[PDB]
Amino acid sequence: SPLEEAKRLLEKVKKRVEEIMKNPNPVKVMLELKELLDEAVHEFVLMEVNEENREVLIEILATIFEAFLHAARDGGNPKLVLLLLLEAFETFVRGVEVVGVTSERELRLVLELLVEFVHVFILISRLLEPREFIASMLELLRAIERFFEVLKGNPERLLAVFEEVLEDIEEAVLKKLTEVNPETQVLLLEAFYEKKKDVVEHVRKALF
Amino acid sequence: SPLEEAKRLLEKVKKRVEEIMKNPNPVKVMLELKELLDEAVHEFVLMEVNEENREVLIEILATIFEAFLHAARDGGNPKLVLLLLLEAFETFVRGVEVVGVTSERELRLVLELLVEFVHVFILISRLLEPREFIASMLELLRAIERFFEVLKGNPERLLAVFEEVLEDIEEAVLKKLTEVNPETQVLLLEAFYEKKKDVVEHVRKALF
Amino acid sequence: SPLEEAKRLLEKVKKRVEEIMKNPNPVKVMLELKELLDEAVHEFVLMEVNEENREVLIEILATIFEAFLHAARDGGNPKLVLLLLLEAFETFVRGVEVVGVTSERELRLVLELLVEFVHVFILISRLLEPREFIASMLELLRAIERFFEVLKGNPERLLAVFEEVLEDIEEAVLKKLTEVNPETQVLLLEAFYEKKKDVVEHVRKALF
Amino acid sequence: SPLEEAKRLLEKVKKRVEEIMKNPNPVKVMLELKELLDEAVHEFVLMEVNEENREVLIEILATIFEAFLHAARDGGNPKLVLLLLLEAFETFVRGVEVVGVTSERELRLVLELLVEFVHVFILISRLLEPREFIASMLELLRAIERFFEVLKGNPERLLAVFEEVLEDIEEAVLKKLTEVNPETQVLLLEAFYEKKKDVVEHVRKALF
Amino acid sequence: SPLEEAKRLLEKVKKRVEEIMKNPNPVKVMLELKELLDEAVHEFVLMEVNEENREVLIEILATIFEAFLHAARDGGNPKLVLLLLLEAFETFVRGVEVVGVTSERELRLVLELLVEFVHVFILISRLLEPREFIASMLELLRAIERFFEVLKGNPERLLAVFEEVLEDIEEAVLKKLTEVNPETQVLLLEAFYEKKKDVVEHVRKALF
Amino acid sequence: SPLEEAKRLLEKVKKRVEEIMKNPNPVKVMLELKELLDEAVHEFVLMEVNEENREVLIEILATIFEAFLHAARDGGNPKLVLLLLLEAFETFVRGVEVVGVTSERELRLVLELLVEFVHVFILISRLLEPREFIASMLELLRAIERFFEVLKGNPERLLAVFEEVLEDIEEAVLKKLTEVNPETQVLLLEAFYEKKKDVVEHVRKALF
Amino acid sequence: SPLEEAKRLLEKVKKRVEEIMKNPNPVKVMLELKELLDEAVHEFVLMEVNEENREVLIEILATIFEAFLHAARDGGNPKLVLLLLLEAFETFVRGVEVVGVTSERELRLVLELLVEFVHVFILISRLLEPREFIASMLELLRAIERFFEVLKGNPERLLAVFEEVLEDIEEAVLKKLTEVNPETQVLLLEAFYEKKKDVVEHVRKALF
Ligand SMILES: [Zn+2]
Ligand SMILES: [Zn+2]
Ligand SMILES: [Zn+2]
Ligand SMILES: [Zn+2]
Ligand SMILES: [Zn+2]
Ligand SMILES: [Zn+2]
Ligand SMILES: [Zn+2]
Ligand SMILES: [Zn+2]
Ligand SMILES: [Zn+2]
Ligand SMILES: [Zn+2]
Ligand SMILES: [Zn+2]
Ligand SMILES: [Zn+2]
Ligand SMILES: [Zn+2]
Ligand SMILES: [Zn+2]
Structure with a gap:
């Protein structure tokens, strides 16, 4: 039976x-959690995957990813942590694509996970230099674009969530870029805004 | 159910x-309240958001913003406090835009919150030097313009409230600018009045 | 046809x-307007560019630059705003050089734009410290000198406009320099007046 | 034994x-006294801390704080001295919170120390400019509020001491504010009285 | 015999x-002391390790760590010294875990060593830039969390010591962050307070 | 023939x-002028170099250096302009050393060039902060010392010119140093006067 | 013969x-002098080294070190010059340790050299920023501690010289630290005074 095996997998x-x-x-914990996420996707x-066990699979993914986000908050070398966060997010997006999201509860769960991921990513990247910070923000923008292209659901709520996380990233970038000269500010702001406009166009094309 | 979840969120x-x-x-309190406001907007x-739970969401926003305004009155470094106040006001405006204001009670709540925000901002900025004071007043004018562009309601009452808070700011600026030479007075008064005329034009265009 | 393509470009x-x-x-608006101005020059x-479509091209440049000047008046960080204003002015001067000014209407349009640019620059730079203010005035003087070297037309009207904008800058500098000690006043006045004399010599050589 | 170790610590x-x-x-003396106070709190x-050695610990704290107050009276740069005084007062409040006050002798000792601290603070801050003077008075009000929130005892005597030190600060502020124009007087008086009303509300809430 | 061998090891x-x-x-002294600490743990x-020789082993660890802390106070390159301090602290924590702490004297010894370690770390890191300073403070927070997770004893005294060292770190961070702009202050304060809240939750879970 | 080749070089x-x-x-102009000066020295x-073509070579050097000084007065970033000015002056000194100065006209030419260089250097460096201003003045003192060590001629006229340019530098430094606190004034004045005494002793040893 | 070879070495x-x-x-001169000092120590x-040629060897060391100190006063990049000064001082201390100081003339010579070294170091480091200035002062304190540990002689005169140079450094630090905010002043003063107390303790242990 699909449901019983899914529940056994959840317990394991x-x-x-x-x-x-x-x-x-913390880094070892993150590596084991990444391995566990990959094994869950392979399973x-x-x-x-019918309409009965979909909730259990989404809950398994949410459990592993919440543990990963907490372990990332625990600490370590910022660059390595950010790289591991991106890899874990890609695995999570692949898992959500495989399982699929139908009901409102699963949509709420995955969107809450996305918001927490963005918050943790910004918190970790606060401590880099402005150029590396802008590079990290560009990587985060690509990740968010991929996530919102994969996901399917109500376009209006998805657009609202996308706009809110974009405002969060923009506020972080504007606050950080006050530590440099105005010429560096103009260069980095131009790069960030070009990338943001491109991802907004792509996401609006995909959602509608 | 929307109403039950909104009430649970209010209690939490x-x-x-x-x-x-x-x-x-006070600074830690302000930072925690800013995080809580962001989390409320994310929720x-x-x-x-239908017409049943809108009042509860407005009440949640009002609760958090009132706590923040009191904590800002408590004290700290004036520049840091003013910047945190501006960030909190921007988040509050975004939340109000998301929820929307329909009835008269919600409009009354948000308008009293704006009046208290202006009073606290002037109280905190009283202690800066005249040039930084004028820069802070310019920032406050931009924030008020954004707020009155976002909000929707009866044009006459909104215009009356806008004029009253403008008179408050103008009185504060006039009282403060008596500590400098007449040439500095002319320079700073010209800057302030140019900005005030611009924001009046923008608000009158947006309201009507 | 050149005229039809120019009108289509104007509408776009x-x-x-x-x-x-x-x-x-406002900063994002300024960046997008700068990109649009560069695209217009590329086009x-x-x-x-014959004698038929020249007026339309001048009108396109004036439209973009007026929008930029208003967005600059809207607000932001003074140093970043002044830097973006200088970049926009150089792009505008390059565009005017490429297109050329023949009739009296185009000369009137560009001279009015120059007067507005000087007024906005002084308004924005009012809020800096005296040393940074004098550095900004030096940059503005170099920009004005370059503009009047590029432009061609009636020498007398151009000289009158140049003298009037110089008087505006001098009045602003004299009003601002009353906030410092007499020794700092002498130093900064010497720097400003040396630069002003040099630019007057250069402009008089170029015009006649 | 607690008592013997406490007496040995007192002798040391x-x-x-x-x-x-x-x-x-004097500044070096103040720095070493701050370090000694921190070491005492660590110990x-x-x-x-039972009811036997509490008196000895209170006398240790009183000894170090009295030495610090005399050294602060000795002299130096007023801003640095005021900042060091605030830091020492916060450390003293933490030590009192850790030890606790039960008998009447300990209460009398700590209240006398608070009165001497307020007197020394006003004496040192007499020589600042009025705006910096009002800023220092706001900081002193926050420190007094924290002290009276931490302390526990008879509400009536504590309220009497609080009102008396408030009257001292108010008299000092009124006497100092006669050196400026009436508009600056109104602004600074408004700031001081708003802060005083807030701290009175907080202290009356905490005591009763 | 365990006791005789422990005493011989202490003398050696x-x-x-x-x-x-x-x-x-100084750096060579620190490296040799780190090697000696590792050799002691291997021994x-x-x-x-019974209840007879435990005191001698704790005394050996305290001797080596006190020598290391003095050599770290002696001087050198701040980043290298801080990294060596962290490595020595980890070795010391592993040694304490292996030996175990039962009586009150051993607890007092290890807690005094922790206070000295925190003071030395802050003293060394005073000379870095604010971003590197906050990164070092985060590393120190992780080290303290690991220490208090390893140690076992009376929860109340341990919690008091933990709170006192946290207040020391907080005072150092607040004093240092006055050298930057308010936006950088907000960013770095948010990072520090998030980490502090996380470690407080972890320590409260471990102790109780 | 040497004279004909020198005249052809002058025309080129x-x-x-x-x-x-x-x-x-202006920066590109300065870079090309520096390259041209280097090429002239190579030639x-x-x-x-006999007594016939020496005047022509001195005139070539004077032409290039006058063009460079005017281009430096035109404007740019003060630090970059000052560093380019120092390199250009060192190349000019090497050229004068290679060619040699025998007649009175060549001496007058090079001394006038030195006076103009000092005036332009002070004018450009007027706009730095006091510490960077004093560092630039120290660099200028080293350059002047090197110039007066290389040059040969009548000791009395050279000493008079050296004293006059020293008085100009001293007046500029004294007028600038009024923008800082008396302690900073004492520190910076001590540094400047130590360097001035050293260069005076070196130049007096070299000339006589 | 030792004396004849020593005199030949002195002449060379x-x-x-x-x-x-x-x-x-100046930098090339300093590097060459450092190499010459190393070669002298190798010789x-x-x-x-008996009692007849000790004076000649001390005179050789004094000659090279006086030349180096003058070359350092000549000028260059402050950080590079300070680092070369520290290396030269360490080589000089090694040479003095190898040769040894017995008579009063040699002690007077080396102590005069130490005073000149401290004066030159403070003069060069006057022009750094306060944080780098304090780092340089810490390095100078370590160098002085090493010097006074190596040297042997009358304890009272050595202690008097040590106290006098310490007062010179303290006066320089106190004068410099007036350019920053009181919080930065407190941090840097705590660091400096901790290091000074440690070096005083070490030197008093070594001398007596
Ligand atoms: Zn955690
Ligand atoms: Zn957010
Ligand atoms: Zn309050
Ligand atoms: Zn009002
Ligand atoms: Zn506008
Ligand atoms: Zn005008
Ligand atoms: Zn006294
Ligand atoms: Zn009193
Ligand atoms: Zn030591
Ligand atoms: Zn402490
Ligand atoms: Zn020129
Ligand atoms: Zn002159
Ligand atoms: Zn010299
Ligand atoms: Zn001295």
Whole structure:
């Protein structure tokens, strides 16, 4: 039965996550969580996904990704942490694509996860230099564009969420760019705004 | 149900505000309240906003903003406090734009919040030097212009409130500018009056 | 046909400007307007400019530059705004050089734009400190000298306009320099007057 | 034994204070006294505080703080002295919070120390300019509010002491504000009275 | 016999520390002390640790760590010294975990060592730039969290010590962050307070 | 023939200078003029310098250096312009050393060039901050010392010129240093006067 | 014979110093003098140092170090010059340790050299920023501590010289630290005074 096997997988994943978080090393915890997410996706593609077990699969993905976001908040080297965050987000997007999102609860869960991911990413990247900060923000913009192209649902709510996270990123960039000379400010602002306009056009094309 | 979830959110926000206000550090309190306001806006864009729960959402926003205004009155470094006040006001305006204001009670709530915000801003900026004071007043004028462009309602009452807060700012500026030489007075008065004329034109275009 | 393509470009530019000015962020509006001005110059150098379509090209340049000047008056960080104003003015001067000014109406349009630019520059730079203010005035003097070297027309009217804008700058500098000690006044006045004498010599050589 | 260790600590602290006060540099003396106060608090949180050794710990704190207040009266740069006084007062309040006040002798000791601190602060800040004077008075009001929120005891005596020190500060502010124009007087008086009303409300809430 | 071997190890370690401290090069002294600490831990895991020799092992660890802290105060390159301090602290925490802390004297010894370590770390990091200073403070927060997770004892005294060292770090950060613009202050304060809240939650979970 | 080749070089250099000066970019003009001066020195060391063509070579150097000084007065970034000015002066000194100065006309020419260089340097560096201003003045003192060590001629006239340019620098420094606190004034004045005494002693040793 | 070889070495070193000092480049002169000092130390360790040739070796060291101090006063990049000054001082201390100081004349010579070194170091470091200035002062304190640990002689005169140079450094630091905010002043003063107390303790241990 699909539902029973999905529930067994959920219990196994919960036990594995609880075991993993006990480690004191944050980078090791992130690596094990990334491996667990990949195994969950591999299990997803090897099983039938009907309308009964979809909620359980979404809950498994949410559990692993929430643990990963907390472990990222725990700390480490910012560049490595940001790279691992991007890899985990790509795996999560692939998993959501495989499973699919139908009901409103799953949409709410994945959107809350996206908001938390953006917040954690900005919090980690606060401590870089302005040029590396702008490069990281460009990478985050690409990731958000990919996520919103994959996801399907009500266009209006998705557009509202997209605009809100974009405002968050814009506020962070504007606050950070006050540490440099006006010429560097103009250069970096032009780069950021060109990328933002492009991703807005792409997302508006995909949603509507 | 929208109404039940909105009431649950209101109770949670009230509990969080009571917990936060107990801290003795005003800057930490302000930062936590700013984070809470952002989280409230995130929750707002993730749920349906019909005519039943709109009052509850406006009440949540008013609660958080009142707590923030009191914490700003508590004290700290004036420049940091003023910048945090501007950021909180921008988040509040975004939340009001998302929720929308329909009835008279919500309009009354947001207008009293604006009046209190202007009073607190002037009170905090009283202690700067004249040039930084005029720069802060220019920032406040831009914020008020943004607020009155976003808001919708009866044009006459909105115009009356706008004129009253403008008179408040003008009186504060006139009283402060008596500490400098007449040439500096002429320069700063010219800057302030040019900005005031521009914002009056913009607001009158937007309202009517 | 050159005239039809010029009119189509005028309509497209008007539509783009109207779309851009709806944004609430003044710095983003300025960046988009600068990009549009550069695109207009690119279009100008790629097409034939005879005596028929010259007026339309001058009107396109005037439209974009008027929108930029208003957006600059809207507000922002003074140093960044002044830097963007200088970049826009250089792009405008290059466009005028490419197109050329023959009739009296085009000369009137460009001279009015120059007067508005000087007024906006002084208004924005009012809020700096005296040393940065004097540096900004030096930059403005170099920009005005370049503009009057590029332009061709009746020497007497051009000299009258140049003298009037110089008097405006001198009045602003004299009013601002009353906030410092007499020794700093002597230093900054010496720097300003040396630069003014040099630019007067250069402009008088170029015009006659 | 707690009592014997507390008495040994008192003897060591007395010897250290006598050794430190022999230095001719007042700022260095203040820095060493701050370090000694921090070390005393560290010792306090690392040992048991019963009803036997509480008096000895209170006398240790009083000894260090009295030495600091005399050194602050000795002289130096007023802004640096005021900042060091505020830091020392906050450390003293933390130490009192850790130890606690039960008997009447300890209450009398700490209240006398607060009165001397307010007197020294007003004496040092007499020589600033009126705007910086009002800023320092606001900082002093916040410090007094924190002290009276931390302390526990008889509400009536505490309220009497609070009202008396408030009257002292008000008299100092009124006497100082006669050196400026009436408009500056109105602005600074409004700021001071708003802050005083807020702190009175907070203290009356905390005491009763 | 365990006790005799422990005392022989103590004498050998004392002789080695005295021999090492005679070197004039601070970085070389720190490296030799780190090697000696690692050797002591290796010896600890190779012998039986009962309730008789535990005090001697704790005294050996305290001796080596006190020598290391003094050598770190001696001087050198701030980044290298801070990195070596973190490595030595991790080795010390592992040694304390291996040996264990049972009586009150050992707890007092290790807590005094922690206070000294925090003071030395702040003193060394005073000379960095604000961004590197905040990064160092985050690393220190992680180190303190790991220490208080490893240690076992009376929850109340441990919590008091933890709160006091947190207040020390907070005062240092607040004093340092006055050298930057308010936007940078907001960014860095948000990062610091997020990390502080996370470590407070983790420590409160571990202790209770 | 040496004289004919020198005259041909003079004509070529005049043509090149006229061609270069037409550029509107001052920094590019300065870079080309520096390259031209270097090429002139290369040509000087590659040809015979008798008493016939010495005047022509001195005139070539004076032509290029006058063009460079005017281009420096035109404007740009003060730090870049000052550094380019120092390099150009060092190249000019090397050229004068290679060619040599024998008659009175050449001495008058080079001394007038030195006076103009000092005036332009002070004019450009008027707009820096006091610490960078004093650093630039120290660099100028080293350059003047090197120039007066290389040059040969009548000791009395050279000493008079050296004293006059020193008085100009001293007046500029004294007038600038009124914008800082008396402690900073004492520090910067001590540095400047130590350097001035050293260069005076060196120049008096070299001349006599 | 030791004395004849020492005198021959003195003559050779005098000739080499006279040849080197003729160079116009200060950094090249300083590097050459550093190499010469190293070669002198190499020669010192390769020959017998009895009581007859000790004076000549001390005179050789004094000659090279005086030339180096003058070259450092000549000028250059402050950071590079300070680093070269520290390296030269360390080589000089090694040479003094190898040769040894017995009579009163040698002690007077080396102490005069130390006073001149401290004066030159403070003069060069006057022009840095306050944070880099304090870092340089910390490095100078370590250098002085090493010097006074190596030297042997009458404890009272050595202590008097040490106290006097410490007062010179303290006066310089106090004068410089008036250019920053009181919080930065407190941080930097705490760092400086901690280091000064540590070096005073070390020197008092070494001398007595
Ligand atoms: Zn965590
Ligand atoms: Zn957000
Ligand atoms: Zn309050
Ligand atoms: Zn009002
Ligand atoms: Zn406008
Ligand atoms: Zn005008
Ligand atoms: Zn006294
Ligand atoms: Zn009183
Ligand atoms: Zn030490
Ligand atoms: Zn402490
Ligand atoms: Zn020129
Ligand atoms: Zn002159
Ligand atoms: Zn010299
Ligand atoms: Zn001295």
